[PDB]
Amino acid sequence: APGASIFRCRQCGQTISRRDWLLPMGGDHEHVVFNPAGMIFRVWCFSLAQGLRLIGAPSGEFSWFKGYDWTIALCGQCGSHLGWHYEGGSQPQTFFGLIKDRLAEGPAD
């Protein structure tokens, strides 16, 4: 009965990722960053995620992770902005950076 197992959208409960899938990018799964609009995000890196909808084509502009280009990742169910999918880089080629406070963590399905 683990209670710290899967991550769902906080707004609607769509299944999104798992604690087992946390990915330590440059030594830490947690990256605290800010965008050009000055919004600060506590980004957790995950090797994998599901239930999102990747919007548009990738961009390298302002990327927080050197070598990676990003696409906005919305909750596929409700449209909540959950984070970004990163691609085009190395080791790994791809991963998700998800905004921690926009997810709810709980027991497995």
Ligand SMILES: O=C1CC[C@H](N2C(=O)c3ccccc3C2=O)C(=O)N1
């Ligand atoms: O790695 C990333 C992902 C995208 C993120 N980002 C944003 O959140 C944003 C909001 C408004 C205008 C431009 C941006 C942008 O590049 C950002 O700054 N870096």
Ligand SMILES: [Zn+2]
């Ligand atoms: Zn949602």
